[PDB]
Amino acid sequence: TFVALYDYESRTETDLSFKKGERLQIVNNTEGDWWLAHSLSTGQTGYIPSNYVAPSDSIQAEEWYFGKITRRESERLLLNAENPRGTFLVRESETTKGAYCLSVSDFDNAKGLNVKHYKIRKLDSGGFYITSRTQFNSLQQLVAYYSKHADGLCHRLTTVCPTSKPQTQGLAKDAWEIPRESLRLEVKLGQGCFGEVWMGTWNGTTRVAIKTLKPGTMSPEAFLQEAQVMKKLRHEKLVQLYAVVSEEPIYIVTEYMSKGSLLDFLKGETGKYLRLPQLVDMAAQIASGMAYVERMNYVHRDLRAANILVGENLVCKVADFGLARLIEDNEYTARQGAKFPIKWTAPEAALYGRFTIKSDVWSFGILLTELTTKGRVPYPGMVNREVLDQVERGYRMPCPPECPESLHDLMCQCWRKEPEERPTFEYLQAFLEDYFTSTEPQYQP
């Protein structure tokens, strides 16, 4: 049997609903993303997302086993407001292959909410331990023991760390080019010069975001070819493309992001108590999504805070990738006109049409100024039509008010004249993740 790691609500007539813990037989796995299953509980059958289950009695079956997750992402989850002391998970060690880590929430009246991390090593004779004093035959035995007594841990293990349900791969088995009629538009989220964004529902059952493009914006044929590329991009910090309607008017169907654009989140009451550590953390997430783009040898072309979306736990994801290259508007193609974001655009890209990952790095630097200013527009003195002239003769925005110079200096590296001397997104992600350096020990005794 397999076991469900999460609840799943049926979206179609041929999928299978199930609850966390339900025992499922996989009865056809000659596939990848959607498997045919059989509830051993209800006797109903139907397709399921394979990432929602694990082999019974596998380590992946344990709800506290988070597998391959970075300590930073495990910290984001554990530091959640609603987590008791001793909320925990087990993950793989990043510094020692073959080792694991118990990460545990704590509260200190000096330090507040914090996370402690204990390296679990295996004793070659094959036993698992955090201290040599106390050793176990399995990880599950270890968690059982420390669920009853703290011993040398900051706190007894009380509560399995909660997480959000994974993204399935697609809306449904073989759903990709979908019929227009499968979508209900409900709430208008936005309108730009090329189309609109709506919250809506797919197949009567599934919350999605839907972007429409005005007819004549781009060829459906070029759109469909690019969409195949967009479809291969899977990353925790990139908004997932679910499906497309590829005849005019085109629809782009994606993951719905509950808190909306970063740009609006930064403004007004939502942003009022946002402090530098949080703003830097959001920048590191964005940088991480773009490091994936970079690793994949791809290019965004329209990076800016309005194209970053915010979810639960202050998760930030890069949106809108793939489209800008397709826009057929003559002005936009020539990097001019009221539709084109000259203020985020590297000068070699505006002048020569050289869009690269280094021009995205330029845009990321501009995004940093939006983050450290509660979203004020870049180059406040200037109109679009003066910006390029000025930047070509070496103008750059000064240090924003209240922004520390060391972060301004990072922006300035992003705005180097020579595109190839600009930092990598790999570099930017590390710099930002480690920006606030603790002396403190990564692990413990």
Ligand SMILES: CN1CCN(CCOc2cc(OC3CCOCC3)c3c(Nc4c(Cl)ccc5c4OCO5)ncnc3c2)CC1
């Ligand atoms: C006042 N509340 C209204 C609801 N909102 C909850 C979710 O808000 C969004 C907004 C989106 O787009 C906004 C981006 C900036 O301009 C206004 C609309 C979402 C979005 N956009 C999107 C983009 Cl940027 C690019 C391609 C797309 C998209 O949809 C699918 O195809 N995508 C997903 N979820 C969105 C949620 C909170 C505030």
